[PDB]
Design an enzyme around this catalytic site. Sequence first.
Site, PDB file in Angstrom:
ATOM      1  N   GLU A 162       0.836  -1.360   0.155  1.00  0.00           N
ATOM      2  CA  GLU A 162       0.075  -0.088   0.153  1.00  0.00           C
ATOM      3  C   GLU A 162       0.737   1.434   0.009  1.00  0.00           C
ATOM      4  O   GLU A 162       1.008   1.808  -1.063  1.00  0.00           O
ATOM      5  CB  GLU A 162      -0.989   0.004   1.091  1.00  0.00           C
ATOM      6  N   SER A 418     -32.615 -46.581  33.387  1.00  0.00           N
ATOM      7  CA  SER A 418     -32.012 -47.281  34.536  1.00  0.00           C
ATOM      8  C   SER A 418     -30.738 -46.513  35.092  1.00  0.00           C
ATOM      9  O   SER A 418     -29.973 -46.859  36.172  1.00  0.00           O
ATOM     10  CB  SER A 418     -31.389 -48.558  34.333  1.00  0.00           C
TER      11      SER A 418
END
Length: 708
Positions: A162, A418
Amino acid sequence: LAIVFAVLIAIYGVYLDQKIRSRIDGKVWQLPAAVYGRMVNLEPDMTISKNEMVKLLEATQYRQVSKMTRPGEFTVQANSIEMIRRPFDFPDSKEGQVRARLTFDGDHLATIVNMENNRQFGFFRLDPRLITMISSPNGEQRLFVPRSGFPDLLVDTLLATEDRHFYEHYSIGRATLTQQLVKNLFLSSERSYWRKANEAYMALIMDARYSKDRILELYMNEVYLGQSGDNEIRGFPLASLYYFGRPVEELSLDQQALLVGMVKGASIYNPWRNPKLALERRNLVLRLLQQQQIIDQELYDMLSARPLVQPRGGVISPQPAFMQLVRQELQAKLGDKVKDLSGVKIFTTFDSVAQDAAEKAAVEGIPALKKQRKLSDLETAIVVVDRFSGEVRAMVGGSEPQFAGYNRAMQARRSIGSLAKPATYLTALSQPKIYRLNTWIADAPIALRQPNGQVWSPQNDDRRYSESGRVMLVDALTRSMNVPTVNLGMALGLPAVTETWIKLGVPKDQLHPVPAMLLGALNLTPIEVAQAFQTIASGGNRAPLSALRSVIAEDGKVLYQSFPQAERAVPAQAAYLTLWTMQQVVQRGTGRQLGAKYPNLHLAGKTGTTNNNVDTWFAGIDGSTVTITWVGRDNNQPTKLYGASGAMSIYQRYLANQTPTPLNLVPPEDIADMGVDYDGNFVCSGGMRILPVWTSDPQSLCQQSEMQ
């Protein structure tokens, strides 16, 4: 002339500065809350192995290498690991990098030595992994990192691109870093030479009142770098983790080229959709800087011959199941007065290693069960919590944990069958003068008249009765015998049993005290089952399950801190006898397939089945954790699975995918090992069977013996 024009632009600039102040002098952004997993402390004489430590490191985003150079890396040797623990802002005290060697003496951590001064640590902190962020209202997600936090090279890679070499305040002539900061931060979308000049004016005003480092410090946290569904992923820090699973400070040069390369175009270079135009943009950056002095030619061909790893993933919503609990716990503890704050840090109880192992067990386990039995839509939920502190380590809410919307660990209320049995035996064993492991329970036909009009006539699994008409309590639980359970439970009374359930911590409005409750007419979620079993696993202390450890503000203010709050629920001796028996169920009872595979873990556990196996469960307790596993179908139809073998297969894979802690049950006070004869009577010496007994004077045997 009308030179006053330079005046109303000067005032327009001065008054512009007014806006580039209230913004930057304070909340630049609404910063989303960061969610971290558990922080592990290592200590000498810790029971862990090297391979176990490797897995914890890799699960914490560490990388194994040949030679160390950067944070977040480690090397393995015959009997030790060397790592560079990365820097982290621990609530307790901020820390930089530390080069340490963990040395292993076979079974445990022998030493931990600071490579700097060659001295030992008394404890050593591992940093927590970033799990996710909490959606920001903006739709824009950021992870703030200061200037220093960025590696010199990614700043060089950024400047090599940039802002070509600098930006002193020529660029325009030939035909801007501060220029673009305002573009993303203040301006509209696109078309306007006025925009070009409006930012240009804001740029000078910007770069006039703020330092160099401060400009790119705001820039490297503002740039758009990705899209997670409908959340903007911007800033290099968050992008790093999102696009590599590693911190910004630790990116390799080729990874720094990619991110930077994605700043110009920030969605078309997206390595997910089209990796080709991204690979070229990456190599392009690699050739951009290659021209300037920063990059060599020889290494260039390496970076270019360096494919992308790259997360090859979507990560739109990490750990959906566990995050549900987190979001829920945040509301309860802090309320809605939290997201008002910015840069909040949430430290959770999440265990990355456990989650990985549960997810793997769920993902591979379920298709395996569907193939071996020709099923079509089998599902599962897994919850792991800490035995003593009740901290939730892992949560799997479906067979496809990666992508979850329906969380079965918290939302799927299911008959426990159970799995309900220990409550009854725990109720009995809490009365050491009347019920013990050797107490005989009738095992004969049952017929219970209930509120109009049918008679409840429960049968054993095999529709058989003990030839003698009786069975010892120890063996009834071990073998999950339906008939003795109801005889025991009915004798104790449904109110007493029901009260045990509440003390164990189950939702009170799920309790309906009729005979079938004893055999599991009780509908719970997996996280609720975990609470109940945590209470007995801890030795009788109810530690409310939690997923939060602390909530810190951006400045370090403690918004929430967790304190231990275990409550004595059942006697420790009764908790102990129940657990000892659950070790029996895993060694010789219904859970015996697990005790054969993991003999040295001495696991305690309980199988859960329902009529026609609509629901199947396993609850497994090891040295350190309680794991609840549920397997069944969403439509509530029979699974075709047989026994608790489906839930025990998932759990067994869970045990194999990590390194389980052996359960070594330490007897509380007033527990004595006592011999009984075949008649079940205590004996002074000898006995063909030895059972622990809650007694402060094992001389209930001189009494037993005096029958003659």
